[PDB]
PDB file of C-alpha atoms in Angstrom:
ATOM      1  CA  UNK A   2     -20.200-168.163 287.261  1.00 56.35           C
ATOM      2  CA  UNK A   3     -18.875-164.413 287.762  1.00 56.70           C
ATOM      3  CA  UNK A   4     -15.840-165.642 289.127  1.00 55.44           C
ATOM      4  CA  UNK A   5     -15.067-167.293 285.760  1.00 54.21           C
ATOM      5  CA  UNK A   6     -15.829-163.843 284.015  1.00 54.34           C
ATOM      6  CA  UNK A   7     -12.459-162.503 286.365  1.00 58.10           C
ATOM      7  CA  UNK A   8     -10.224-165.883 285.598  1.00 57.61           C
ATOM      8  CA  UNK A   9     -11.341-165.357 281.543  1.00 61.54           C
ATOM      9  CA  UNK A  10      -9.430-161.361 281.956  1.00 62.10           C
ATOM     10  CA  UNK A  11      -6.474-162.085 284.062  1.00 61.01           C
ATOM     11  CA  UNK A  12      -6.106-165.456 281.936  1.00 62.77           C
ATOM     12  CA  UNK A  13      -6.630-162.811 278.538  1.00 64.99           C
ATOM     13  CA  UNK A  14      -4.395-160.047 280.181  1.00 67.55           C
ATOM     14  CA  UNK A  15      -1.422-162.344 280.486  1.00 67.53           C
ATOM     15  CA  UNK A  16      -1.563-163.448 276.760  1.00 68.03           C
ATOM     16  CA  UNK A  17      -1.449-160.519 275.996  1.00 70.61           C
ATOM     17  CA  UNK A  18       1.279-159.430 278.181  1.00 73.77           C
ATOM     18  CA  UNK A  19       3.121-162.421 276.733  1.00 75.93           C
ATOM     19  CA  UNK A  20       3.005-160.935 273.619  1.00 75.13           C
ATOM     20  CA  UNK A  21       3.733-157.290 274.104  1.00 77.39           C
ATOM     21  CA  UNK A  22       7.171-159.405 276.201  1.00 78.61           C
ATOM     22  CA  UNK A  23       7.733-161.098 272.572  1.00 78.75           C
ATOM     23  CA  UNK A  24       7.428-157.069 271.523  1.00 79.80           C
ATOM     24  CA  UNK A  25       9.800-155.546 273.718  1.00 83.66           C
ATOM     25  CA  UNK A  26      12.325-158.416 272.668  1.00 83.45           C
ATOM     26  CA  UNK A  27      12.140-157.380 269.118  1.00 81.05           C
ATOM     27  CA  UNK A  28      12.394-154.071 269.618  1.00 81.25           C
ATOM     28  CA  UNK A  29      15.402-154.813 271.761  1.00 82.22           C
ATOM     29  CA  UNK A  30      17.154-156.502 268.777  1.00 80.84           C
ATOM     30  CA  UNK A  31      15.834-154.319 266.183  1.00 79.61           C
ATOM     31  CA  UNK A  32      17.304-150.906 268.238  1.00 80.31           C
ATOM     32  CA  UNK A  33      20.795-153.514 268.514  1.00 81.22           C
ATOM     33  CA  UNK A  34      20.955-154.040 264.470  1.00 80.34           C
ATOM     34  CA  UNK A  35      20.503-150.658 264.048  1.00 79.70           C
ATOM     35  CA  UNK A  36      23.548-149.576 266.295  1.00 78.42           C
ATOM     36  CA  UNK A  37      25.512-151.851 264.943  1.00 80.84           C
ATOM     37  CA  UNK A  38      24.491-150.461 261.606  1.00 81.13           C
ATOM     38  CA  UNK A  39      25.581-146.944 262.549  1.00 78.85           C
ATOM     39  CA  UNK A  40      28.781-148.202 263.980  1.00 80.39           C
ATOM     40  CA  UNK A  41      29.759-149.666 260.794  1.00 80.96           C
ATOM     41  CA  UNK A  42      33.322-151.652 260.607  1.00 83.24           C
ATOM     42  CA  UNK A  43      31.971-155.160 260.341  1.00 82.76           C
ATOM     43  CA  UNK A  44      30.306-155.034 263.735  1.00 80.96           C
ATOM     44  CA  UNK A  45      26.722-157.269 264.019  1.00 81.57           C
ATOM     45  CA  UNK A  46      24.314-158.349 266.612  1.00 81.32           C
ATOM     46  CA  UNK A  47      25.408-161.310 269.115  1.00 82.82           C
ATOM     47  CA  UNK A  48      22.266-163.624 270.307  1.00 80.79           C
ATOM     48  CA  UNK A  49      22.295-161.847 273.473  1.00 81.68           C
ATOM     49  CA  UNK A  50      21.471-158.840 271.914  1.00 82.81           C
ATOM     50  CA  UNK A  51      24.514-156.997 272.381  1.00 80.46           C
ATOM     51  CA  UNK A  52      27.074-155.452 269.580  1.00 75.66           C
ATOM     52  CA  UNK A  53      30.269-157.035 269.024  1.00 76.60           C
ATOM     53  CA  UNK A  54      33.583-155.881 267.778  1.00 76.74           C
ATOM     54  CA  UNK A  55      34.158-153.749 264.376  1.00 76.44           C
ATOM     55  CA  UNK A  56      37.274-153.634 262.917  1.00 73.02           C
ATOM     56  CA  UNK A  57      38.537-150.081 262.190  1.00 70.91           C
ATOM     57  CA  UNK A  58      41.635-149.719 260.405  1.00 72.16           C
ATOM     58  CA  UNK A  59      43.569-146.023 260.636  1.00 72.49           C
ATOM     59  CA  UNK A  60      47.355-146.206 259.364  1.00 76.09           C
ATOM     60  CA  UNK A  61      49.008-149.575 260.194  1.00 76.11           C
ATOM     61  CA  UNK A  62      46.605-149.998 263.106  1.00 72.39           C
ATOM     62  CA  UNK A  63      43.373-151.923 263.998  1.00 73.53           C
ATOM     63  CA  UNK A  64      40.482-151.006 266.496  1.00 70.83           C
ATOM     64  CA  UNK A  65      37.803-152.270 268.167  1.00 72.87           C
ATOM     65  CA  UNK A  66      36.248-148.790 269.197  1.00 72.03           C
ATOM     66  CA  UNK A  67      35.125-145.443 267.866  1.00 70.83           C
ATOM     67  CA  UNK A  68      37.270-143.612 270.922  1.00 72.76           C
ATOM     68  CA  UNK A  69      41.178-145.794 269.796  1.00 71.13           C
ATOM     69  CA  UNK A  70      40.092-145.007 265.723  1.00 70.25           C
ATOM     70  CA  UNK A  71      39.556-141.096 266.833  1.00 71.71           C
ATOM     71  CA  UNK A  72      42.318-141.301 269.314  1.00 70.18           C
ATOM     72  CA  UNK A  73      44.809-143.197 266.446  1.00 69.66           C
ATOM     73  CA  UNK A  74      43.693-140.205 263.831  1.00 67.77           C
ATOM     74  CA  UNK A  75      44.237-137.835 266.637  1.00 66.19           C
ATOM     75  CA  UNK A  76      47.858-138.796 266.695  1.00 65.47           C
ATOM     76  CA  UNK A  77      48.398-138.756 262.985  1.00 68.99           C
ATOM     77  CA  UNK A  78      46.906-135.659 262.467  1.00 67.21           C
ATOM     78  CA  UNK A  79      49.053-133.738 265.449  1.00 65.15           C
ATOM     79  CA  UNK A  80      52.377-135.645 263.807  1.00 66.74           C
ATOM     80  CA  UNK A  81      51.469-134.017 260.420  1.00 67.95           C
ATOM     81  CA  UNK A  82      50.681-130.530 261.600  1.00 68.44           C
ATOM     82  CA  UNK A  83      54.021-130.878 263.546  1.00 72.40           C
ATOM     83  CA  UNK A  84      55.607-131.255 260.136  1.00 72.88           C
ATOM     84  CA  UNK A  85      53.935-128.408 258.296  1.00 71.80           C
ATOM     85  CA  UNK A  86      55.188-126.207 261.219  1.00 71.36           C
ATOM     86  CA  UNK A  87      58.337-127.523 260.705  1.00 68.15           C
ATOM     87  CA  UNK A  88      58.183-126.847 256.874  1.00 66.19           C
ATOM     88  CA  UNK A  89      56.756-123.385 257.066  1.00 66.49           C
ATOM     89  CA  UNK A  90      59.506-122.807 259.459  1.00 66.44           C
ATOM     90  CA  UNK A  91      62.181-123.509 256.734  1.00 68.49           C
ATOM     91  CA  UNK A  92      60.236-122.280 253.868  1.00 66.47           C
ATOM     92  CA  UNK A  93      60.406-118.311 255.884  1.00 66.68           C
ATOM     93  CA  UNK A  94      64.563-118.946 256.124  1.00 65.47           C
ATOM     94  CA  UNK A  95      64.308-119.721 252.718  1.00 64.67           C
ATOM     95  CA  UNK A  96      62.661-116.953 251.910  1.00 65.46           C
ATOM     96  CA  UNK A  97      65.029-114.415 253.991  1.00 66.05           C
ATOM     97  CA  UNK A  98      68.293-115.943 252.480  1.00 63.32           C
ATOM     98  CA  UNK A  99      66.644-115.878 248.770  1.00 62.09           C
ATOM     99  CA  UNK A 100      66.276-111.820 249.908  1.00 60.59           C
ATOM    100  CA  UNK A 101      69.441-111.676 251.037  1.00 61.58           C
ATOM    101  CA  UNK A 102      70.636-112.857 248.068  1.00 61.49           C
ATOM    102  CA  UNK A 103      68.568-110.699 245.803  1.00 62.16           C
ATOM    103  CA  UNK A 104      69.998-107.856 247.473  1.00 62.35           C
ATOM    104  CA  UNK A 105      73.723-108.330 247.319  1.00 63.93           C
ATOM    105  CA  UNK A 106      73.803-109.584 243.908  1.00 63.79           C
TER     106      UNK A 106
ATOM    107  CA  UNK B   1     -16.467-166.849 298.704  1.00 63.59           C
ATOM    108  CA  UNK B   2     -14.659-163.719 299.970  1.00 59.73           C
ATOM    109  CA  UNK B   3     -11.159-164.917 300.011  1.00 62.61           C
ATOM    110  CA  UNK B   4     -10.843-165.767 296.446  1.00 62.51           C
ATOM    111  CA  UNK B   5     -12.846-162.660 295.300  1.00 61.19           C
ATOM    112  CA  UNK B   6     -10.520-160.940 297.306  1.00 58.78           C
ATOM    113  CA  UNK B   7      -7.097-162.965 295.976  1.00 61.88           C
ATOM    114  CA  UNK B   8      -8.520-162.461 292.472  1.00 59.66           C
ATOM    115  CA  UNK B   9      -8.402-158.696 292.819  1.00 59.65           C
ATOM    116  CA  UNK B  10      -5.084-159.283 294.184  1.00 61.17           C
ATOM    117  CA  UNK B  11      -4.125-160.703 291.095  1.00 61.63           C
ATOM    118  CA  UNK B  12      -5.729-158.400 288.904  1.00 62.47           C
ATOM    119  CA  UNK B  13      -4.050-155.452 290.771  1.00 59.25           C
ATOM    120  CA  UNK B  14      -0.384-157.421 290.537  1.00 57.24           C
ATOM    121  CA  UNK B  15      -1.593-158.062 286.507  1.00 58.23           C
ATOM    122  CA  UNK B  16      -2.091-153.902 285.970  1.00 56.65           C
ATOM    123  CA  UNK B  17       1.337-153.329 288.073  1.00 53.42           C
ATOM    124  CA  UNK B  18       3.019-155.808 285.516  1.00 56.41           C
ATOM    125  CA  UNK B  19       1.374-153.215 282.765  1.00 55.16           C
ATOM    126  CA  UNK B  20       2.749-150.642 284.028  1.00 56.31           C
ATOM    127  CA  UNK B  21       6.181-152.121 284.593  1.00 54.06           C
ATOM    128  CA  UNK B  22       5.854-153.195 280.612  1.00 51.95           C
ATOM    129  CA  UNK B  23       5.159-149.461 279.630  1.00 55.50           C
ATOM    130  CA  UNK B  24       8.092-148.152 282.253  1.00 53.93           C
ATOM    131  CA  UNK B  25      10.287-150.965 279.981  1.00 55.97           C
ATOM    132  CA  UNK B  26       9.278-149.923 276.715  1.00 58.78           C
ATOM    133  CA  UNK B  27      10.054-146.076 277.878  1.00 57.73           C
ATOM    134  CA  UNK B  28      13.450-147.166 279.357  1.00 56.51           C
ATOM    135  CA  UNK B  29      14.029-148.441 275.326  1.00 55.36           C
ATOM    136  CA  UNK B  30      13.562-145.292 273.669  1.00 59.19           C
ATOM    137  CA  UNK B  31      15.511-143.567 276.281  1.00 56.09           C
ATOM    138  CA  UNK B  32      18.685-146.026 275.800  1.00 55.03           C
ATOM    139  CA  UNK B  33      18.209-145.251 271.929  1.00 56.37           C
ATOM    140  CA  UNK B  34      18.167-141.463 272.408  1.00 58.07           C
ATOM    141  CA  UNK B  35      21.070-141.774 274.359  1.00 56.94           C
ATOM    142  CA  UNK B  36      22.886-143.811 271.560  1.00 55.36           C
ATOM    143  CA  UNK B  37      20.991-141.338 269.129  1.00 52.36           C
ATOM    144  CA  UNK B  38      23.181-138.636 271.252  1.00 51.75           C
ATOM    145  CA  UNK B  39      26.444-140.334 271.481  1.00 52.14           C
ATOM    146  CA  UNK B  40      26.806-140.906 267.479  1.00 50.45           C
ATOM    147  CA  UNK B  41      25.647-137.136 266.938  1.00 52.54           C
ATOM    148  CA  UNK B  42      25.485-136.180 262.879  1.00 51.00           C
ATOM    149  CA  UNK B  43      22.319-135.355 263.533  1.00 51.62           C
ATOM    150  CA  UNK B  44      21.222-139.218 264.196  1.00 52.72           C
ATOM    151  CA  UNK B  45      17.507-139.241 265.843  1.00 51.64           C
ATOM    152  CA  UNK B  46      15.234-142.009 267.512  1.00 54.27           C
ATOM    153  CA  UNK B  47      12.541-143.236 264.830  1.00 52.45           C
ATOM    154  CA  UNK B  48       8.700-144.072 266.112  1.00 49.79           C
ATOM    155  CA  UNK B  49       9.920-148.117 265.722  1.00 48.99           C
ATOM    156  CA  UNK B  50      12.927-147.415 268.541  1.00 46.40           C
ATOM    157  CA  UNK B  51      15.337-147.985 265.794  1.00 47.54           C
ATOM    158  CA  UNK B  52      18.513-145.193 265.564  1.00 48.40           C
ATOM    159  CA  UNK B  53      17.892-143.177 262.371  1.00 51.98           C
ATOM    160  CA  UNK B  54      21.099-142.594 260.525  1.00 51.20           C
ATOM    161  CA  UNK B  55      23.417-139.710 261.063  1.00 48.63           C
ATOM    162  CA  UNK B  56      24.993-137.707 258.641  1.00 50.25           C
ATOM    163  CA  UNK B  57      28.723-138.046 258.689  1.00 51.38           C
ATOM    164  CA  UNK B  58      30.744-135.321 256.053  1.00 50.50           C
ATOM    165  CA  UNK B  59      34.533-136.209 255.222  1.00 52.76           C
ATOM    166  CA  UNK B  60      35.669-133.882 252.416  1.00 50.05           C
ATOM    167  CA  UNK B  61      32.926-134.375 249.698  1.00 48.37           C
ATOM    168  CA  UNK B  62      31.590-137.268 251.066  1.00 51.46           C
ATOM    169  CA  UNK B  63      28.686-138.085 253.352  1.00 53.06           C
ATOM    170  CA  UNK B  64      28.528-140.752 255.196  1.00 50.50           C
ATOM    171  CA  UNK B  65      26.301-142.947 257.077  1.00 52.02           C
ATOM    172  CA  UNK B  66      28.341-144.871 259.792  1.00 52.26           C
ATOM    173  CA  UNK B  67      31.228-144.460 261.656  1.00 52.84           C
ATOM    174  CA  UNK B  68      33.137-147.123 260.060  1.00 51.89           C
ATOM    175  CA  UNK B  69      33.216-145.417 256.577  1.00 53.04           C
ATOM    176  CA  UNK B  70      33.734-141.826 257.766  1.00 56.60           C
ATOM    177  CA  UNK B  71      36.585-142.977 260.019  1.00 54.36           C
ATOM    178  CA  UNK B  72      37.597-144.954 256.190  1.00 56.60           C
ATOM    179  CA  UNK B  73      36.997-141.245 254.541  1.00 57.26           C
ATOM    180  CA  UNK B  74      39.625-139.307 256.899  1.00 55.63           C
ATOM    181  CA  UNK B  75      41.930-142.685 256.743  1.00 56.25           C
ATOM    182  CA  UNK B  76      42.413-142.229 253.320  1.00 55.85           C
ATOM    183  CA  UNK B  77      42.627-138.275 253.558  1.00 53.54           C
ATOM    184  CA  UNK B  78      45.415-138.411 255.877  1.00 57.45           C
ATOM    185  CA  UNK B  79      47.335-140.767 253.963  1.00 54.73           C
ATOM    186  CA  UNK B  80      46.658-138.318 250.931  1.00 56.53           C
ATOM    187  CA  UNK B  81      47.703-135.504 252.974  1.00 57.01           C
ATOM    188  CA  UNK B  82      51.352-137.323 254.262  1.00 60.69           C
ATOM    189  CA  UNK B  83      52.048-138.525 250.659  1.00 61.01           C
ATOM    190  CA  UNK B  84      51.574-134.496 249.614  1.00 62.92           C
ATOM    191  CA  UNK B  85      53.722-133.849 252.476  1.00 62.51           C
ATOM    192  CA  UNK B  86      56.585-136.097 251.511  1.00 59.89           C
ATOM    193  CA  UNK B  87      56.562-134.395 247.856  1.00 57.48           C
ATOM    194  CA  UNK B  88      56.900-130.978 249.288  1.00 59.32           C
ATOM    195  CA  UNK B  89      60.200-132.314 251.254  1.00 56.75           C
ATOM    196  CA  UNK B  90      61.679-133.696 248.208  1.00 53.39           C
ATOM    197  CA  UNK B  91      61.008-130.188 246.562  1.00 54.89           C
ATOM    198  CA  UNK B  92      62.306-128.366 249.965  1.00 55.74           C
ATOM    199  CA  UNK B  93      65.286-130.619 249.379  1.00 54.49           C
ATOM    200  CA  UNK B  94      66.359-129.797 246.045  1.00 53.53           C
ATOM    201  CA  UNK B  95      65.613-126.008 246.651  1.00 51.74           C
ATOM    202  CA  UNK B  96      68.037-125.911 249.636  1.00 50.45           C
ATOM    203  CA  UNK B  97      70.914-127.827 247.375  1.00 51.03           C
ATOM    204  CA  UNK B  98      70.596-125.096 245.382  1.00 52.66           C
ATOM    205  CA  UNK B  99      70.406-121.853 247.520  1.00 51.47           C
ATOM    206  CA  UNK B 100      73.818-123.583 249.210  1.00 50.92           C
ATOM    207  CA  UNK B 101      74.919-123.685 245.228  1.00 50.25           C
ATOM    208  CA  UNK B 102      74.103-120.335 244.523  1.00 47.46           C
ATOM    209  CA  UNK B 103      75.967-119.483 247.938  1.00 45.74           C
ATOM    210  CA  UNK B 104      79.260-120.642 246.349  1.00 42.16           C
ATOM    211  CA  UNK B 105      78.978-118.448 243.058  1.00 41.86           C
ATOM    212  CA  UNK B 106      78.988-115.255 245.047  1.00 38.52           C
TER     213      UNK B 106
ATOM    214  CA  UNK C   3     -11.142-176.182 290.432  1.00 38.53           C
ATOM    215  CA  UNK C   4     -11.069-172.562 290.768  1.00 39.71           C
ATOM    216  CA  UNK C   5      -8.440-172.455 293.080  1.00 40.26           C
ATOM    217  CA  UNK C   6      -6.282-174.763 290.363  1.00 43.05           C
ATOM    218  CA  UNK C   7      -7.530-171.789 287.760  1.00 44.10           C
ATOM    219  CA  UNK C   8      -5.812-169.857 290.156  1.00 43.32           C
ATOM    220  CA  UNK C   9      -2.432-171.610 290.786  1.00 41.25           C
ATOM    221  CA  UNK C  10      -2.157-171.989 286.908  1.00 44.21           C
ATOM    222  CA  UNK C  11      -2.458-168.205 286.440  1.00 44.53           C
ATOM    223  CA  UNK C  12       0.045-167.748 289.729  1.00 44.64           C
ATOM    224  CA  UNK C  13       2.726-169.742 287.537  1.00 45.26           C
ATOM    225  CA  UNK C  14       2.038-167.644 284.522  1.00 46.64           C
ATOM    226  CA  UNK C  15       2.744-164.618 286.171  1.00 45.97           C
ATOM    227  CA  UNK C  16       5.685-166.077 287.629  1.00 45.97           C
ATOM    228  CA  UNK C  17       7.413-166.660 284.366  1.00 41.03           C
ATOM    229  CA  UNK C  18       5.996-163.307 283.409  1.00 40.22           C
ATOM    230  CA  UNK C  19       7.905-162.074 286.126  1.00 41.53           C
ATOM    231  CA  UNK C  20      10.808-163.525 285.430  1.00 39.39           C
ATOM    232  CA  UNK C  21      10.955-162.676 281.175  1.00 38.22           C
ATOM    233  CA  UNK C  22      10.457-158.976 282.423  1.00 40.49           C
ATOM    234  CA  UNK C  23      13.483-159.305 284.436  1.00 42.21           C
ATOM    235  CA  UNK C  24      15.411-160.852 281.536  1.00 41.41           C
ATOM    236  CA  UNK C  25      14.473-158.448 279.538  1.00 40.84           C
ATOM    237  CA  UNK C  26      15.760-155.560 282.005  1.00 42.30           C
ATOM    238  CA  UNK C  27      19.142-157.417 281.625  1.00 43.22           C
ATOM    239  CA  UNK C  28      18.800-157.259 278.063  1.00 44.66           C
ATOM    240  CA  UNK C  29      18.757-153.692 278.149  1.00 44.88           C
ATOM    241  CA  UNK C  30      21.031-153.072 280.482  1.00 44.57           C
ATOM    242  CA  UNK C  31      23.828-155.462 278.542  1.00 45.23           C
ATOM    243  CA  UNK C  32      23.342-153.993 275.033  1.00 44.89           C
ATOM    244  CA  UNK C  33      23.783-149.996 276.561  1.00 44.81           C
ATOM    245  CA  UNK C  34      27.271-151.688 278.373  1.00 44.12           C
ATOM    246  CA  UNK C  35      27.958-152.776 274.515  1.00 43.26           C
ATOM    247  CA  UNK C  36      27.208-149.610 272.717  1.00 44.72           C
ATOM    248  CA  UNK C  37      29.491-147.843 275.860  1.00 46.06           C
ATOM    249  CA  UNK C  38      32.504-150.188 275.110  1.00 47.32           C
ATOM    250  CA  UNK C  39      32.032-149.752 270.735  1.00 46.57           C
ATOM    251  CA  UNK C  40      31.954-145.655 271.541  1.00 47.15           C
ATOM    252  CA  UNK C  41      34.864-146.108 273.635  1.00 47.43           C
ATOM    253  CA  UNK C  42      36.282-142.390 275.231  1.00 47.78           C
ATOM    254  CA  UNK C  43      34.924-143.501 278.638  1.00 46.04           C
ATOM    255  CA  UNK C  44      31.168-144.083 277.873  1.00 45.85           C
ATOM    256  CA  UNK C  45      29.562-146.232 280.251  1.00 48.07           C
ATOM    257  CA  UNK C  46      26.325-147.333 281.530  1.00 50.80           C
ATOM    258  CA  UNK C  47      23.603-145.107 283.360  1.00 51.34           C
ATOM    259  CA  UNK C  48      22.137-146.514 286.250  1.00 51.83           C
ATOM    260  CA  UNK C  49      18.579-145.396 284.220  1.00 53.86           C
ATOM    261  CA  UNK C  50      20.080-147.566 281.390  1.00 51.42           C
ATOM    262  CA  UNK C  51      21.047-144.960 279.346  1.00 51.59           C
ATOM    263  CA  UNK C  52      24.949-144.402 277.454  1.00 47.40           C
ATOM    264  CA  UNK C  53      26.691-141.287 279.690  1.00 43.64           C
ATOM    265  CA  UNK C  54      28.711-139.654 276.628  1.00 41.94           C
ATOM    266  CA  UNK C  55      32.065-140.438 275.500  1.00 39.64           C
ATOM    267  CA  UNK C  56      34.789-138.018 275.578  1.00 39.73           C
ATOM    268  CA  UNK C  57      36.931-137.563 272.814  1.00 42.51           C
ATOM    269  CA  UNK C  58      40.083-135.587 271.970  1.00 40.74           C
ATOM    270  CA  UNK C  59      40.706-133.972 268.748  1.00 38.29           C
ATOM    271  CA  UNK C  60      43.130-131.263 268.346  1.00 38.56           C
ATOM    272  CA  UNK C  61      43.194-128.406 271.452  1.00 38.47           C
ATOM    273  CA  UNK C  62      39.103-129.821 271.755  1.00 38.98           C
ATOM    274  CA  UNK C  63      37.080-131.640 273.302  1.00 39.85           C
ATOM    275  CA  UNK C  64      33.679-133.635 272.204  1.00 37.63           C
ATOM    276  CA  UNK C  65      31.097-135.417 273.554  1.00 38.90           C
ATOM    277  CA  UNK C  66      29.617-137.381 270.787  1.00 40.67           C
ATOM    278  CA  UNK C  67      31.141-138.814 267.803  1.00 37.88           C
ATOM    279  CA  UNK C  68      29.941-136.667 264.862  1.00 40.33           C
ATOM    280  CA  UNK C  69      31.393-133.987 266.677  1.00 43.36           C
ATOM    281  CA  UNK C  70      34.577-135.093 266.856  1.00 42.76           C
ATOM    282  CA  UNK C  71      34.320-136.676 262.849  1.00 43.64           C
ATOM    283  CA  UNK C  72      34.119-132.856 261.991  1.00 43.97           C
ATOM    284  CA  UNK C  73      36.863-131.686 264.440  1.00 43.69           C
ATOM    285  CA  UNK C  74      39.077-133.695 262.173  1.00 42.07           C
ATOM    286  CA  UNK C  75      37.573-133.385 259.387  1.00 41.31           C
ATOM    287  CA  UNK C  76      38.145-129.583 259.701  1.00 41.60           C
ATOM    288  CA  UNK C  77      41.569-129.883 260.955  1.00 43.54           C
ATOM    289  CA  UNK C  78      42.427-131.975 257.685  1.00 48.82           C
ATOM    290  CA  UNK C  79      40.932-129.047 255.384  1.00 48.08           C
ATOM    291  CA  UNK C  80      43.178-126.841 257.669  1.00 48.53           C
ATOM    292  CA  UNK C  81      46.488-128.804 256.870  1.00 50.74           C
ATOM    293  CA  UNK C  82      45.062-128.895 253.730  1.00 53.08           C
ATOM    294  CA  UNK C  83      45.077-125.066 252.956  1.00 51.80           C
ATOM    295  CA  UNK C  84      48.436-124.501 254.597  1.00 55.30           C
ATOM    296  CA  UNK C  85      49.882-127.069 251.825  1.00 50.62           C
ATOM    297  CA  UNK C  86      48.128-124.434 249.665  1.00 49.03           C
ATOM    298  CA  UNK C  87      50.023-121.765 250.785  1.00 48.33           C
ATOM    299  CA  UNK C  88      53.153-123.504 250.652  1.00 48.05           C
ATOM    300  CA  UNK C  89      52.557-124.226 247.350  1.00 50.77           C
ATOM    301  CA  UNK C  90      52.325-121.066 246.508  1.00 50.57           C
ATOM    302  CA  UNK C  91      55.647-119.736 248.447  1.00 51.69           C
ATOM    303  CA  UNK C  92      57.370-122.859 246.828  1.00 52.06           C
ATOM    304  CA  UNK C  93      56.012-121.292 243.295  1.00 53.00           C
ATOM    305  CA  UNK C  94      57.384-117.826 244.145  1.00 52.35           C
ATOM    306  CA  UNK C  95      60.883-118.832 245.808  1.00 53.57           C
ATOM    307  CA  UNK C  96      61.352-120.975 242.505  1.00 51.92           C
ATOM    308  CA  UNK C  97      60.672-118.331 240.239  1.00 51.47           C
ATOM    309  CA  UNK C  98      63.179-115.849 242.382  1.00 52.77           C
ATOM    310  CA  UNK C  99      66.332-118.304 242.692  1.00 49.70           C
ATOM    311  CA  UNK C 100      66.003-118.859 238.554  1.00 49.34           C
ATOM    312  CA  UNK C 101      66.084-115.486 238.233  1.00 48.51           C
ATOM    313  CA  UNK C 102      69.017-115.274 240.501  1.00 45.90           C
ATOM    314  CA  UNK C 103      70.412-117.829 238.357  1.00 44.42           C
ATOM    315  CA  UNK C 104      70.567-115.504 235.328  1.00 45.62           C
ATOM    316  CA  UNK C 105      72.058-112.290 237.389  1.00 46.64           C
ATOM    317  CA  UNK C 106      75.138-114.258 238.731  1.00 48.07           C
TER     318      UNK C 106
END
């Protein structure tokens, strides 16, 4: 008799513990569709809840990572402000032997 | 009888540390999406559902909502920026050719 | 029959047992995911959590990916005013040699 009233709670507690499980395991995927959203490139959810690969493209290469697409633009972006040094560089000369000129003519 | 009055408590008591276990779980959620909330920065956020709210990515004029598409943005900036580039040596070029030129006639 | 009440409920709690540590594993594999898409070094926390990436971008360094989006961004609009300028000293050094042009 008042045993029964324990075995009906502990036999309602773990339905309902079942359920808030079948919770958490959404949540789980819902927080792993959302990263993958953020991510962007292409990348999705796997069945085992984890995010698989985008596909960044930067120049002629691909990557499957936000730290190789940042590193790649890294490296683009040092080569071209290389240049511009460079180009300043000749644009003073030019400069001094336009003045040069302009003096002696 | 005493001994399963006494298990059932037992069971009861490993049914509330389960709970608690459950709630420790759901915290240890939120606290991975923070940290993902973190890592993506632009100003991304943990909504009440555990989801990751979207950051705010700018690239020029644009905004952008994912990392794919602002990486895209500065991608095609760059590529604007070399093709600029490799006018301005064409007119560096033609401008020394003609210094050397104007070199001769003096 | 109580005490097959009981061994029913021991099972449930079993498998209850065992979900929750599936579950953990879960967690723990989709934060070793998100650590390998940031790249830069993330990896797992033992608490589950992502420790931060670290990116490179120009003389800098940054912890989290918006930060470095706007490192380059800025570094673009940086290039992107020097081409400016030399746009303007191209202008000027034009205008000078044609007007050398006419003197000689």
């Amino acid at each position: 008799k008042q045993i029964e009233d324990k075995i009906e709670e502990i036999l309602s507690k773990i339905y309902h513990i079942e359920n808030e499980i079948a919770r958490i395991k959404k949540l789980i995927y819902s927080l792993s569709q959302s990263v993958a959203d953020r991510l962007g490139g292409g990348a999705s959810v796997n069945s085992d809840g984890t995010v698989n690969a985008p596909l960044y493209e930067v120049g002629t290469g691909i990557y499957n990572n936000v730290g190789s697409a940042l590193s790649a633009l890294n490296t683009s972006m040092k080569q071209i402000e290389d240049k511009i040094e460079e180009i300043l560089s000749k644009i003073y000369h030019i400069e001094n032997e336009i003045a040069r000129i302009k003096k002696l003519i």
